[PDB]
Amino acid sequence: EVETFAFQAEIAQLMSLIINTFYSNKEIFLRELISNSSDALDKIRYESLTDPSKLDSGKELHINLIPNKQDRTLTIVDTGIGMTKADLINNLGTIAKSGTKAFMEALQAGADISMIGQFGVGFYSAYLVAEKVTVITKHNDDEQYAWESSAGGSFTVRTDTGEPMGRGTKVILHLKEDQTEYLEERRIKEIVKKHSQFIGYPITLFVE
Ligand SMILES: CSc1nc(C)nc(N)n1
Ligand SMILES: [Mg+2]
Cα 190 to Cα 187: distance, rounded to the nearest angstrom: 5
Cα–Cα distance, 146 to 85 (Å, whole number): 9
Tell which atom from ligand 1 comes closest to the C-alpha of 41: 9
Nearest alpha-carbon partner for 166 in 60, 42, 40: 60
- The CA distances from residue 153 to 46, 144, 201, in Å, are 35, 24, 34
The closest alpha carbon to 23, from 116, 109, 106, 105, belongs to 116
Ligand 2 geometric centre to CA of 38 (Å): 22
Mutation choice for ligand 1 from 79, 125, 135, CB with most ligand atoms inside 8 A: 135
Identify the experimental approach: X-ray
Cα–Cα distance for residue pair 101/120, rounded to 1 Å: 11
What atom in ligand 1 is closest to the CA of residue 171? Answer: 6
Residue nearest to atom 8 of ligand 1 (CA): 37
Resolution of the entry in angstroms: 1.9
> Comparing C-alpha atoms, which of 12, 3, 39, 198 is closest to residue 117?
39
* 3-state class (DSSP) for residue 171: strand
> Torsions phi, psi of 8, nearest 5?
-55, 150
Query: Does 169 sit in the ligand 1 pocket, CB within 6 Å?
Result: yes
Domains and CATH numbers, the chain: 1-208 (3.30.565.10)
Q: Identify the burial level of 46 via C-beta atoms within 10 angstroms of its C-beta, where 0-12 means exposed, 13-18 middle and 19 or more buried.
A: exposed
- Strand-pairing partners, residue 68, are 73
Report phi then psi at 61, rounded to 5: -110, 110
85: CB partners within 8 A, 6+ apart: 142, 143, 145, 157
State in Å: Cα 137 to ligand 2 middle.
Answer: 22
Ligand 1 mutation target, pool 38, 78, 81, 116, most atoms within 8 A of CB: 78
